[PDB]
Design a protein around this motif. Sequence first.
Motif, short mmCIF file in Angstrom:
data_model
loop_
_atom_site.label_atom_id
_atom_site.label_comp_id
_atom_site.label_asym_id
_atom_site.label_seq_id
_atom_site.Cartn_x
_atom_site.Cartn_y
_atom_site.Cartn_z
N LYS A 46 0.81 -1.21 0.00
CA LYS A 46 0.00 0.00 0.00
C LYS A 46 0.84 1.26 0.00
O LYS A 46 0.56 2.19 -0.77
N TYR A 47 1.87 1.33 0.84
CA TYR A 47 2.69 2.53 0.89
C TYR A 47 3.85 2.46 -0.09
O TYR A 47 3.93 3.25 -1.03
N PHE A 48 4.74 1.50 0.11
CA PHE A 48 5.94 1.49 -0.70
C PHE A 48 5.67 0.83 -2.05
O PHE A 48 4.64 0.20 -2.26
N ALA A 49 6.62 1.06 -2.96
CA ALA A 49 6.58 1.04 -4.43
C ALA A 49 5.78 2.23 -4.95
O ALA A 49 5.71 2.42 -6.17
N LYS A 50 5.18 3.03 -4.07
CA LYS A 50 4.36 4.18 -4.42
C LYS A 50 4.83 5.37 -3.59
O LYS A 50 4.72 6.52 -4.01
N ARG A 51 5.32 5.09 -2.38
CA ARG A 51 5.89 6.11 -1.52
C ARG A 51 7.36 5.85 -1.22
O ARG A 51 7.92 6.40 -0.28
N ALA A 52 7.98 4.98 -2.02
CA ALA A 52 9.43 4.94 -2.10
C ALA A 52 9.97 5.99 -3.05
O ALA A 52 11.19 6.12 -3.19
N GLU A 53 9.09 6.74 -3.71
CA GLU A 53 9.52 7.84 -4.55
C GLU A 53 10.04 9.02 -3.74
O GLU A 53 10.85 9.79 -4.25
N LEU A 54 9.57 9.17 -2.49
CA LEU A 54 10.08 10.22 -1.62
C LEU A 54 11.55 10.02 -1.29
O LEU A 54 12.27 10.99 -1.03
N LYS A 55 12.01 8.77 -1.28
CA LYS A 55 13.42 8.49 -1.09
C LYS A 55 14.15 8.27 -2.40
O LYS A 55 15.38 8.24 -2.41
N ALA A 56 13.41 8.14 -3.50
CA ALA A 56 14.05 7.79 -4.77
C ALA A 56 14.79 8.98 -5.35
O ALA A 56 16.02 8.98 -5.43
N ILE A 57 14.06 10.02 -5.74
CA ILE A 57 14.69 11.17 -6.36
C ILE A 57 14.56 12.43 -5.51
O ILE A 57 15.36 13.37 -5.67
N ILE A 58 13.65 12.45 -4.52
CA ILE A 58 13.61 13.55 -3.56
C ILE A 58 14.67 13.37 -2.48
O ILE A 58 14.80 14.22 -1.59
N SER A 59 15.45 12.30 -2.55
CA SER A 59 16.71 12.20 -1.83
C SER A 59 17.87 12.16 -2.82
O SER A 59 18.93 11.60 -2.52
N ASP A 60 17.68 12.74 -4.00
CA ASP A 60 18.72 12.88 -5.01
C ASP A 60 18.91 14.35 -5.35
O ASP A 60 18.13 15.20 -4.91
N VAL A 61 19.96 14.64 -6.12
CA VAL A 61 20.41 16.02 -6.29
C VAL A 61 19.43 16.82 -7.15
O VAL A 61 19.11 16.46 -8.29
N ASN A 62 18.88 17.87 -6.55
CA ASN A 62 17.87 18.76 -7.12
C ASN A 62 17.91 20.03 -6.28
O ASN A 62 18.97 20.41 -5.77
N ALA A 63 16.78 20.72 -6.17
CA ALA A 63 16.67 21.69 -5.09
C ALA A 63 16.72 20.94 -3.76
O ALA A 63 15.69 20.51 -3.22
N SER A 64 17.93 20.81 -3.21
CA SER A 64 18.23 19.97 -2.05
C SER A 64 18.13 20.74 -0.74
O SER A 64 18.79 20.40 0.25
N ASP A 65 17.27 21.75 -0.72
CA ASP A 65 17.00 22.58 0.44
C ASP A 65 16.08 21.87 1.41
O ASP A 65 16.01 20.64 1.44
N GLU A 66 15.39 22.66 2.25
CA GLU A 66 14.35 22.16 3.13
C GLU A 66 13.23 21.40 2.42
O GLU A 66 12.49 20.68 3.08
N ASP A 67 13.07 21.56 1.10
CA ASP A 67 12.23 20.66 0.31
C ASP A 67 12.72 19.23 0.42
O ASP A 67 11.93 18.30 0.63
N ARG A 68 14.03 19.02 0.27
CA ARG A 68 14.58 17.69 0.50
C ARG A 68 14.51 17.32 1.97
O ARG A 68 14.15 16.19 2.31
N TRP A 69 14.84 18.27 2.85
CA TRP A 69 14.86 18.01 4.29
C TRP A 69 13.48 17.69 4.83
O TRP A 69 13.36 16.91 5.78
N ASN A 70 12.43 18.27 4.24
CA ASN A 70 11.08 17.91 4.67
C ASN A 70 10.76 16.47 4.28
O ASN A 70 10.15 15.74 5.06
N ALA A 71 11.20 16.04 3.09
CA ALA A 71 10.91 14.68 2.64
C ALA A 71 11.66 13.65 3.47
O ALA A 71 11.14 12.55 3.70
N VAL A 72 12.87 13.98 3.93
CA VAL A 72 13.60 13.11 4.84
C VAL A 72 12.93 13.09 6.20
O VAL A 72 13.00 12.09 6.93
#
Lengths: 50, 100, 98, 154
Positions: B18-44
């Motif tokens: 129910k959650y993962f394979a669908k909410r593993a995206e928060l760790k997939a690329i939102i823990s990858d190099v982008n706007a790596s500010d508090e946007d990333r820190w909120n997802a972590v």
Amino acid sequence: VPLDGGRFATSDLNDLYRRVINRNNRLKRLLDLAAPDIIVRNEKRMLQEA
Amino acid sequence: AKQSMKAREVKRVALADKYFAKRAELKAIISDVNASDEDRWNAVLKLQTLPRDSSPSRQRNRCRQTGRPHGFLRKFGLSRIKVREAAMRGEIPGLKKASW
Amino acid sequence: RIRIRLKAFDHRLIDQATAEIVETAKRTGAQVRGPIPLPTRKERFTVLISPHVNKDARDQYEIRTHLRLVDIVEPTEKTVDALMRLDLAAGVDVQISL
Amino acid sequence: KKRWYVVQAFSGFEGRVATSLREHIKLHNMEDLFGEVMVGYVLVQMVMNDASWHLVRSVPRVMGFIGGTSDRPAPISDKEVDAIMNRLQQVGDKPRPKTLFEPGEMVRVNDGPFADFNGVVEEVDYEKSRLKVSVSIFGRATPVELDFSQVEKA
DNA sequence: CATGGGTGCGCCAGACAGGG
DNA sequence: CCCTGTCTGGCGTCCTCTCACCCCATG
């Protein structure tokens, strides 16, 4: 059953049933893509008479 | 083998479906190099408010029949005991006491 | 023209079944490359047999899967249906790539 | 203003009825009383005078108009006329090929010996313009390559 | 090839108008 | 409504023995 020659001497009821089924298929086609009221009134009237 | 511990396994595959394979995206690329500010820190932060289950590392892969946690075999899904009693019967295709 | 790659566990079965898969083709398509065997994948699982101690008594197992190729020559519609639609021998995988 | 009407002909001689109708118009030169003729039913852009009504029923191999009555026959109560026209346009229109496809997407086969069968595209090849889809033949999905136009998107 | 588009009978009888 | 005229339907003997002929038409 055919005759001596080979041409099938067909009964009259096969003409009647084949007419009713031809008209019923036409009327169903006039329910899918269909056509205006006057057309389906003539189509249902021909089915009624058939 | 501890039917509660069988039931604890079956609820973990549901949460992982129910959650993962669908909410593993928060760790997939939102823990990858982008706007790596508090946007990333909120997802972590935002993946700890998920349950402590629903991650696939919590799954144990117990036996399909006996639920035995050790001695698993990821070709058949059985433990090493239940694969041997089945194979000598002929419940498992194309397998035999072989030697080379 | 069409690769016919078929897999099964029994060798006396997969090689029996390849005789009729060209007999249903050379009857109609009348040109097949030839029965090509392929090196078999032997997967071994050697594992303990006792429910406790004595980790020296193990039993070696092996599951042998075989592969055969015939790679039919002629892509005439008659031959296509005589193989694609006409698949025989339950327990024998057959997969085709045109 | 010329409104539409429906004519019944002997079904099968319909083009010859349309040609004879255009010719009767250009014989009895009521050219300002007829607009078109569309093709067992013949559509006529027309007005209603009793002279033009006798003209259309004096055209050979024509039974009569189809309407509420035979005194004042009925124009066009369009109910499924637009639907029929749209269907004809789509059929005689450029059939869009099923290019958009992705792995695990079901497709439809309407060509070759796999005609009338569905399956899924496990692999796709835009460069080779070929879709890798298998069709359950005797239950066994027979992975076969079909073109975008050879199969339809499901 | 396959489908679809006459005008010479006479009585009884009851139902449907048609006056009455 | 109570009688009168019209309009359609329903029907007309049983057995046999030959014959002849069964939908065009056509883009």
